[PDB]
Amino acid sequence: SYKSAHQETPLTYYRATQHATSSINHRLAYINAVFVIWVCDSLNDVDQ
Amino acid sequence: MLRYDSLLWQCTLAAGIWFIPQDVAAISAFLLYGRSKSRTINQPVYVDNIDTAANEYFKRKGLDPTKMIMMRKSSKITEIRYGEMY
Amino acid sequence: AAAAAAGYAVHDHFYDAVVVGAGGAGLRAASGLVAHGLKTACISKVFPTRSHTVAAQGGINAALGNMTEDDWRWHAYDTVKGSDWLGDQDAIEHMCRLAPQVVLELESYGLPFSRTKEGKIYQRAFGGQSLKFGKGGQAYRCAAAADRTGHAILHTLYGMSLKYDCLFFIEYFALDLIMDQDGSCKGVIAMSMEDGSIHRFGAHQTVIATGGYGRAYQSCTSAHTCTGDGGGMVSRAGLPLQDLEFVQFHPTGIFPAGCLMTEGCRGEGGILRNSEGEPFMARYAPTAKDLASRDVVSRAMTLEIREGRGVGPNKDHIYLHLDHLPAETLRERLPGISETAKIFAGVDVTKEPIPVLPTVHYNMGGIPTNWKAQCLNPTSSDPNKIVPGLLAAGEAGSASVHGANRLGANSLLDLVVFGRTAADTVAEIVKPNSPPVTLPKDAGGGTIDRFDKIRHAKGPVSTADLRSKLQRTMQTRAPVYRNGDDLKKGCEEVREIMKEYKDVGIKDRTLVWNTDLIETLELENLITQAAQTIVSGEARKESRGAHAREDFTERDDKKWMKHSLSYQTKPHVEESDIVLKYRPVVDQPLDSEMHHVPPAKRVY
Amino acid sequence: ARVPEDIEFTKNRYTRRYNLATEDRVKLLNWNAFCIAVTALPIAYVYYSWYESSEDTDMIYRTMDPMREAKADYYLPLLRGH
Amino acid sequence: MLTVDKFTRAEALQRASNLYYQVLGTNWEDGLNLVLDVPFWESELEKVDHMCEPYLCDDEIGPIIRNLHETVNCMYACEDVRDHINELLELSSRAEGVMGSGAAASEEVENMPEQCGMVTKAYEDLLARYPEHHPKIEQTVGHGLAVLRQLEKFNFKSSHRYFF
Amino acid sequence: MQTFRVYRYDPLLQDKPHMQEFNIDLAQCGPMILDALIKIKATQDSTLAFRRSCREGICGSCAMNINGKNGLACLQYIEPGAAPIDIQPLPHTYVLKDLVPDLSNFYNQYKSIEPFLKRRRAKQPGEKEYYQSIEDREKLDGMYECNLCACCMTSCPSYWWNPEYYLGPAVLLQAYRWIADSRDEFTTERMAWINDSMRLYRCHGIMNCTSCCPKGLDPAKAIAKMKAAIAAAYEPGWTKIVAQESIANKKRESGMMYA
Ligand SMILES: CCCCCCCCCCCCCCCCCC(=O)OC[C@H](COP(=O)([O-])OCC[N+](C)(C)C)OC(=O)CCCCCCCCCCCCCCCCC
Ligand SMILES: CCCCCCCCCCCCCCCCCC(=O)OC[C@H](COP(=O)([O-])OCC[N+](C)(C)C)OC(=O)CCCCCCCCCCCCCCCCC
Ligand SMILES: *Cc1cc2c(cc1C)nc1c(=O)[nH]c(=O)nc-1n2C[C@H](O)[C@H](O)[C@H](O)COP(=O)(O)OP(=O)(O)OC[C@H]1O[C@@H](n2cnc3c(N)ncnc32)[C@H](O)[C@@H]1O
Ligand SMILES: COC1=C(OC)C(=O)C(CC=C(C)C)=C(C)C1=O
Ligand code: SF4
Ligand code: F3S
Ligand code: FES
Numbered sequence A: 001s002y003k004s005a006h007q008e009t010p011l012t013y014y015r016a017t018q019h020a021t022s023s024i025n026h027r028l029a030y031i032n033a034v035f036v037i038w039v040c041d042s043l044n045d046v047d048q
Numbered sequence B: 001m002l003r004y005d006s007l008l009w010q011c012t013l014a015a016g017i018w019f020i021p022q023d024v025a026a027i028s029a030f031l032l033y034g035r036s037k038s039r040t041i042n043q044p045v046y047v048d049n050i051d052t053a054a055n056e057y058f059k060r061k062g063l064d065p066t067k068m069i070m071m072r073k074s075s076k077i078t079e080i081r082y083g084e085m086y
Numbered sequence C: 001a002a003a004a005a006a007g008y009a010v011h012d013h014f015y016d017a018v019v020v021g022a023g024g025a026g027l028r029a030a031s032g033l034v035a036h037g038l039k040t041a042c043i044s045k046v047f048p049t050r051s052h053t054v055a056a057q058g059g060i061n062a063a064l065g066n067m068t069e070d071d072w073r074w075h076a077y078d079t080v081k082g083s084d085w086l087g088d089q090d091a092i093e094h095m096c097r098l099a100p101q102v103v104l105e106l107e108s109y110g111l112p113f114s115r116t117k118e119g120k121i122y123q124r125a126f127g128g129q130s131l132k133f134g135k136g137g138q139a140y141r142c143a144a145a146a147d148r149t150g151h152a153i154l155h156t157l158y159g160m161s162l163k164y165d166c167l168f169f170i171e172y173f174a175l176d177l178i179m180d181q182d183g184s185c186k187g188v189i190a191m192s193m194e195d196g197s198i199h200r201f202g203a204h205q206t207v208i209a210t211g212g213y214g215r216a217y218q219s220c221t222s223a224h225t226c227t228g229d230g231g232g233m234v235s236r237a238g239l240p241l242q243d244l245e246f247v248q249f250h251p252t253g254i255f256p257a258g259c260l261m262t263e264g265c266r267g268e269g270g271i272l273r274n275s276e277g278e279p280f281m282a283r284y285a286p287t288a289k290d291l292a293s294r295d296v297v298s299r300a301m302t303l304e305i306r307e308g309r310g311v312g313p314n315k316d317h318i319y320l321h322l323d324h325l326p327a328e329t330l331r332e333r334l335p336g337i338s339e340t341a342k343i344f345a346g347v348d349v350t351k352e353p354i355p356v357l358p359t360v361h362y363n364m365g366g367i368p369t370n371w372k373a374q375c376l377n378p379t380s381s382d383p384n385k386i387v388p389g390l391l392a393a394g395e396a397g398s399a400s401v402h403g404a405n406r407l408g409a410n411s412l413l414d415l416v417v418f419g420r421t422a423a424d425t426v427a428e429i430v431k432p433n434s435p436p437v438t439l440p441k442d443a444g445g446g447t448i449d450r451f452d453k454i455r456h457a458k459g460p461v462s463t464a465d466l467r468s469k470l471q472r473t474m475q476t477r478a479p480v481y482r483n484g485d486d487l488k489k490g491c492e493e494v495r496e497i498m499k500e501y502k503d504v505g506i507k508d509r510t511l512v513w514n515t516d517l518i519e520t521l522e523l524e525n526l527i528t529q530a531a532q533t534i535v536s537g538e539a540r541k542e543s544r545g546a547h548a549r550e551d552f553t554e555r556d557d558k559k560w561m562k563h564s565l566s567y568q569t570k571p572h573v574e575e576s577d578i579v580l581k582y583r584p585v586v587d588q589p590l591d592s593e594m595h596h597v598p599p600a601k602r603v604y
Numbered sequence D: 001a002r003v004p005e006d007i008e009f010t011k012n013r014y015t016r017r018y019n020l021a022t023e024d025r026v027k028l029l030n031w032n033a034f035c036i037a038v039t040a041l042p043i044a045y046v047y048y049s050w051y052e053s054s055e056d057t058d059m060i061y062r063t064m065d066p067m068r069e070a071k072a073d074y075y076l077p078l079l080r081g082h
Numbered sequence E: 001m002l003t004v005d006k007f008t009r010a011e012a013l014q015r016a017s018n019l020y021y022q023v024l025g026t027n028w029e030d031g032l033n034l035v036l037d038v039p040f041w042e043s044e045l046e047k048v049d050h051m052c053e054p055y056l057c058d059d060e061i062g063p064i065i066r067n068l069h070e071t072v073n074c075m076y077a078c079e080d081v082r083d084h085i086n087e088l089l090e091l092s093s094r095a096e097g098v099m100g101s102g103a104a105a106s107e108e109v110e111n112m113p114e115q116c117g118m119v120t121k122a123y124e125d126l127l128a129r130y131p132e133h134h135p136k137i138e139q140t141v142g143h144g145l146a147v148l149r150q151l152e153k154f155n156f157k158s159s160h161r162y163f164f
Numbered sequence F: 001m002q003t004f005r006v007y008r009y010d011p012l013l014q015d016k017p018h019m020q021e022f023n024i025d026l027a028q029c030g031p032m033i034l035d036a037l038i039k040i041k042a043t044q045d046s047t048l049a050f051r052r053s054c055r056e057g058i059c060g061s062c063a064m065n066i067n068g069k070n071g072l073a074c075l076q077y078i079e080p081g082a083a084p085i086d087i088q089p090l091p092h093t094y095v096l097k098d099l100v101p102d103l104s105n106f107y108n109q110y111k112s113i114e115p116f117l118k119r120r121r122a123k124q125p126g127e128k129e130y131y132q133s134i135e136d137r138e139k140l141d142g143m144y145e146c147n148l149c150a151c152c153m154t155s156c157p158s159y160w161w162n163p164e165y166y167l168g169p170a171v172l173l174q175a176y177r178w179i180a181d182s183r184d185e186f187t188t189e190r191m192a193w194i195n196d197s198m199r200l201y202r203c204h205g206i207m208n209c210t211s212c213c214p215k216g217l218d219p220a221k222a223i224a225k226m227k228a229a230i231a232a233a234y235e236p237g238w239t240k241i242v243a244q245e246s247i248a249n250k251k252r253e254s255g256m257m258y259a
């Protein structure tokens, strides 16, 4: 008759530290490099 | 639920401040390398009067002025084309 | 299992032993029973590591002899003097003779004790401890682990219980005992605060290892969970409670927070000063100025503030100066005090004095017990008669090792020793494998009915208001220095608060983590014990240990060297009276290894 | 939603139910098979790729350096750019 | 098995004991451990069986083979139950919705009280079938049932030993 | 007159959790957050539920999320301001009722590391305390003070995502405490068991555990040390060591254990 609740994602409210934002920028480093390569490839193909 | 000091909003601004500058430079370098090649292959050359230039071209290349459709592509761009091109 | 009593889902368990409490005393008893091969359960309101034992700071007393030469017999003499010749010398010998072994066992399970230069356990000076039966000097018997000796013990005893694989029923609030018609405990009846189900644990031998009832006063060092639930259960079973008038006020408690500053602070050089800047403690207890018995120090502090030599803008407290001591020693030996002061008082220990005031800390009273931790139901002919199936351990129990005043660093020792003894005593009674107990036919009926009556309570007064009223009366009518007139006034007031529990009302009617209901059930336990305390104190016309009557300022060994037994007439707190009987104190030691310490003056 | 209520769970290594753990092992094999196949792309580039300016290069070697031993006088400015 | 390789009894004993402890030591709860390792374990187990066939009655090799077979049986059986539990918990998580908001939420298991009665029965059946592998059964299936207990309030025998 | 929004959930109605706003006069309330919650319960809404025992920060029972960051209510200070003080349960935990989290998984994971001293030889009769130097005891300084508040646990983004596979900061620090205790003789066994991709290497060094620790401990530093020690000391035979210990626990009761 009783059920527990599941709290939402903590990302929306948990306080952010400078070490946590910078750790993400490190884990996203390779993701940006691929993105830039794709942009340059697209530009070399659809521009000038 | 939503907060400015949230891990999401502070990790999205940090990423933007950190990557957007790097990226703008990176893409710009590619754009610069593109211009270096383009300006060495077909540098834009400005002529005064299009009609006189077209005549000198037809004369220099031995092209019959009647078979060449000259069209104005833009306010600052004209373009001679073959009218009998398949 | 599955049954349905008065519409409630009742599960039935059938163990060989049940331990109510997962504090120091309860964790030790459980590990011991499991180690003896007996099927056992350990019920607790909180995760075992959150019990009040974790807040202990000083240490445990053992005649290890790591700092100086020592004898357990010397520790035993100190305890007798500290008890003001109200504690049983039989139980004191058993505890002191086992203190070395118990402490080493705790180290063997990984207790991170502080160490000496030779790799042995460091021992600190504490109040009321001497050498050579008082003819020597300060004794360094308190094996401490920095300012966190409780956290260490409780965590280590939990680890030991995990190693032995003890069945734990965590977040289960025990309601009553399943007593038999003959008069034998057959188990406990508890509720789960996480599921809302009632469980009827049926055991051959039950161990009540709850804590004290220190939250019955406005200002205490006790936890909010310290409501004395096992004493109420015993009182509602018709069994006696003992020495409830002897409530210990710790000399140093942060003002007004009510937090505790370890006695080790003074035991490492700390000095208490007044408005005149005097170490006044030399006038009272001159030989051991600040390291006197906790009852002497507290009375001295109260008289000083009363005389007008108090510190502060309101001249209401006393100052504890640890600033003169080395900063390294403060950081190494008193690591926890410093932070707590910085927060709850805003004091820098190394540069400023700490505001302190005597505060209720421990309760020497509890369930009457023998030296084997078997609860007693004394009769006029058999003062040592024991309840057939019940045992007690810890602050909840009163084996009278501590008598009228507890010596610092002896309670944590009583947790380990008597928890171990309780497990040994059950092993002899209950065999490792035994036919299951036969829970009586109407087991829990009354408890379920009362729980339902309280669950659906819609009266005018609120639990919080009633609790504040009780806390106020206890704080004002039973202070450090008690007078007979106030004790009488208060005794009338607590009786009114008893009949006012019939008007309490709760707003939450759920069963899953209904703190409102749980707190009202706790208030019943708090009221009955607080009532018995005031009644017993007013009845004692002497001044022994923590009980200091201004009307009668002298010990009466001739007519008051007795244990005071209180009884609740009826199971309902709003339908009962507090009757008082007495039982004699055991003065002869259990063996000849120790001698009888004759009653004498307690000057300190 | 709802979920089946009469599942015959695996009892031993020779009486096995098909579950998503076995499907994940097939995925491991199929992904690894792709890796073996995609290795043919980089290996084919290295084998078939030729870096030559014109068709002249081979004619020069056939008529001037057939044994790959003929020595050419070196004028540094030619390839030094200055 | 089709092979021309020949191995001594000492080599056969070594290979079988290596595989037995390798399987019994690997963490079964982590799914990627079993998914990645089982292909290598199955190739090795076929070779071990071929070379240990003469020594099935041997006093040293024989017991190793019997324990190895039992461990593999328990490994497959436990993995199956925890796989279903993982399915139930992932159905529950998807029901929460995107960001926990409930925005794009999947429909939520309706026979969850009954799906928890099925798993607990399976857990007890494993305990009886594999009495000498309780530590592994508790690592995988026992802990799995403890996670489910945090979502649905159900009763199983070892619930109290999992702090419920 | 500060405003305190508090998370509220009834386990029976099972209605969507909501934040209710209360107004409290800080003049008649204690400085700490826990005092405000007690005052609200005593005066306005007695239904409010929350865990609290020690009042001095030592029990580790009042762990909550205050204005975004985890902490113990008894040590947290009320910060008056126009902005309501938001109090919620511990992040990404199952809420049993109002602010009371469900930390059963945390308790089980701790039991898994077997936090009790292990020695190969049983204390010989006539033996005193096991020798440990002051320097050795100093190694266990910042690790033995953990009160199990579970803030560092419910602040790690890696425990949010994989709660049932990652041991979490608090358990991992406790494992290092027993791997660093000179008296323990099962150093290799403990390191071998903890050397798992999910158990240990899910820590990405976010450092939220160290930032929110109420006791001022550094779980992040301990996990880094434990990873370095394992990497240097790994041997091919570790897997067999884990298996042999698992055989030793064959007759243990039903609960989390080394396996
Ligand atoms: C387990 C087997 C896996 C096989 C998977 C499938 C094939 C993988 C192939 C791997 C190599 C690929 C190299 C790059 C692509 C080459 C393409 C190419 O140009 O090929 C022609 C060329 C030949 O040159 P070529 O000039 O004649 O042809 C190329 C033509 N042009 C120049 C126009 C591009 O191949 C090579 O040059 C590659 C030679 C590789 C030699 C490797 C030697 C390995 C030695 C290992 C010793 C180990 C000892 C162990 C002892 C243990 C004792 C206990
Ligand atoms: C025997 C001793 C051993 C010593 C070992 C020491 C090794 C370490 C030293 C570095 C060696 C590597 C040199 C680079 C390769 C040769 C350069 C080349 O081909 O360029 C000439 C080519 C020459 O082409 P060219 O057509 O212009 O040449 C004709 C020149 N004129 C016109 C004057 C006649 O340069 C270019 O084409 C222009 C683009 C060059 C871009 C170079 C980018 C750098 C590449 C290396 C990256 C390294 C990454 C690691 C560092 C991390 C950085 C964040
Ligand atoms: C309060 C205090 C006491 C103290 C101390 C410091 C403080 C602030 N320092 C000490 C020291 O340095 N040296 C020493 O020798 N003693 C010291 N003390 C004394 C000691 O810590 C206390 O007396 C302690 O309470 C004794 O331990 P005990 O095991 O008897 O009790 P507990 O730790 O309070 O835990 C009791 C358990 O019972 C459970 N419980 C309570 N009611 C119920 C119900 N109704 N149902 C089920 N379980 C119940 C509690 O949850 C707890 O687990
Ligand atoms: C509560 O809702 C969500 C999860 O469940 C815990 C996620 O796993 C995660 C984490 C996954 C990624 C890809 C960061 C997110 C973002 C999410 O919204
Ligand atoms: S490491 Fe800190 S936050 Fe984590 S449980 Fe221990 S005291 Fe609490
Ligand atoms: S926040 Fe988590 S990722 Fe590591 S550094 Fe702390 S345990
Ligand atoms: S109430 Fe104990 S940590 Fe706050």
Ligand SMILES: [K+]
Binding pocket: F178, F179, F180, F181, F182, F183, F184, F185, F186, F187
């Ligand atoms: K070690």
